[PDB]
Design an enzyme around this catalytic site. Sequence first.
Site, PDB file in Angstrom:
ATOM      1  N   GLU A 173       0.817  -1.204   0.000  1.00 45.99           N
ATOM      2  CA  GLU A 173       0.000   0.000   0.000  1.00 45.99           C
ATOM      3  C   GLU A 173       0.847   1.248   0.000  1.00 45.99           C
ATOM      4  O   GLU A 173       0.587   2.172  -0.779  1.00 45.99           O
ATOM      5  CB  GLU A 173      -0.896  -0.009   1.252  1.00 45.99           C
ATOM      6  CG  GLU A 173      -1.864   1.180   1.288  1.00 45.99           C
ATOM      7  CD  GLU A 173      -2.832   1.161   0.127  1.00 45.99           C
ATOM      8  OE1 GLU A 173      -2.751   2.006  -0.784  1.00 45.99           O
ATOM      9  OE2 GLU A 173      -3.664   0.234   0.130  1.00 45.99           O
ATOM     10  N   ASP A 185       0.987   4.076  -2.922  1.00 45.77           N
ATOM     11  CA  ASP A 185       0.669   5.471  -2.629  1.00 45.77           C
ATOM     12  C   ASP A 185       1.814   6.398  -3.056  1.00 45.77           C
ATOM     13  O   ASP A 185       1.593   7.386  -3.745  1.00 45.77           O
ATOM     14  CB  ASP A 185       0.354   5.640  -1.156  1.00 45.77           C
ATOM     15  CG  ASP A 185      -0.715   4.746  -0.603  1.00 45.77           C
ATOM     16  OD1 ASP A 185      -0.838   4.656   0.646  1.00 45.77           O
ATOM     17  OD2 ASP A 185      -1.448   4.129  -1.443  1.00 45.77           O
ATOM     18  N   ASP A 217     -13.253  -0.207  -1.583  1.00 46.91           N
ATOM     19  CA  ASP A 217     -13.000  -1.218  -2.612  1.00 46.91           C
ATOM     20  C   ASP A 217     -14.084  -2.288  -2.612  1.00 46.91           C
ATOM     21  O   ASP A 217     -13.932  -3.351  -3.223  1.00 46.91           O
ATOM     22  CB  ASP A 217     -11.647  -1.845  -2.393  1.00 46.91           C
ATOM     23  CG  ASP A 217     -10.436  -1.013  -2.729  1.00 46.91           C
ATOM     24  OD1 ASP A 217      -9.315  -1.547  -2.470  1.00 46.91           O
ATOM     25  OD2 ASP A 217     -10.610   0.111  -3.221  1.00 46.91           O
ATOM     26  N   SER A 260      -7.396   2.798  -3.462  1.00 40.87           N
ATOM     27  CA  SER A 260      -6.053   3.061  -2.928  1.00 40.87           C
ATOM     28  C   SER A 260      -5.102   3.629  -3.976  1.00 40.87           C
ATOM     29  O   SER A 260      -4.111   4.224  -3.594  1.00 40.87           O
ATOM     30  CB  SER A 260      -5.354   1.795  -2.411  1.00 40.87           C
ATOM     31  OG  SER A 260      -6.019   1.307  -1.266  1.00 40.87           O
TER      32      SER A 260
END
Length: 369
Positions: A79, A83, A169, A286
Amino acid sequence: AGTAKGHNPTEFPTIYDASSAPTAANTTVGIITIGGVSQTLQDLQQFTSANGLASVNTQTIQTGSSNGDYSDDQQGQGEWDLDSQSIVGSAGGAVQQLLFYMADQSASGNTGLTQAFNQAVSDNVAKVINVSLGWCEADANADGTLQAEDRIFATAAAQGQTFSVSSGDEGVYECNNRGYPDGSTYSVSWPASSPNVIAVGGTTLYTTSAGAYSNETVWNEGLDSNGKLWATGGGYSVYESKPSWQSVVSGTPGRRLLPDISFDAAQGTGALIYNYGQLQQIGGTSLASPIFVGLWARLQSANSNSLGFPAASFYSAISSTPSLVHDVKSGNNGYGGYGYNAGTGWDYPTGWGSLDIAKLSAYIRSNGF
Ligand SMILES: [Ca+2]
């Protein structure tokens, strides 16, 4: 029309018409994480080096107890990788600094995460902060997390900081064990449902053979092998009142509607991300949120970091100026005939759609924001 394929993050400025804008070189950007980012920083070096970019200035911030647990969460690195690489790509390959606000993993409940948001607001050094996280708003409400965290985001908005939060999501099924189909029972994610953040939903991104924007549909990739839905979060909060700037979306309840805007989220059209040294094609809201953060940070740099919390301006500008967005019209964010449908103008899967950054920049030069 167009082709569904993976994309290098450095492609997002071309796709969303940002190449002619300044990079985010004059804007500091934050990323909220759970735990540490040691592998993520190595993957970021791989990212900038492979793409021939100047290295990014980073800082890591222990936001809670100095005796807290800031070890790397292995799955979490993917993640923070998504990002950071998507922000820097979208930003045109430069940010002033990237600050990682790390939540203590050994804090009680959600208090580590709350303290990470708090530190980013207290410090007030990052103009734009990414939050590619969320969970059922009703669960956040029940244990008091919602109330605690909304106070923090309210302070952020008042001081002119933009928190960007993935809308979810799970499509409309956020609260049903995180995305299991539940018929007509619809719910939304926290902290996206806060009126004090920008909630960013998800599209399926089609490009031309020359790599230009072609079209976007709703992100909905159906069920995985466990039976969980993968689709853009969207709907309205059951708790949060409608902020007045959302009144331009007529025929909706007196609640915070989300998302506000959307960007690429389908895994099948996702980003190519270095994770533990290996490239993976990754999507989700995300992904969409950091695309927004990088693009918005360019507009901050173009405006001397003087743009305040932009929700009211997005709603007034886009409702009156449809050329500022790519309006998503096709698809749904449920399953089995249920969920919300995209349509003309603002809709529950995608909000206003994606931003055309050069057109938005010209609007801002003329009108302010
Ligand atoms: Ca639409």
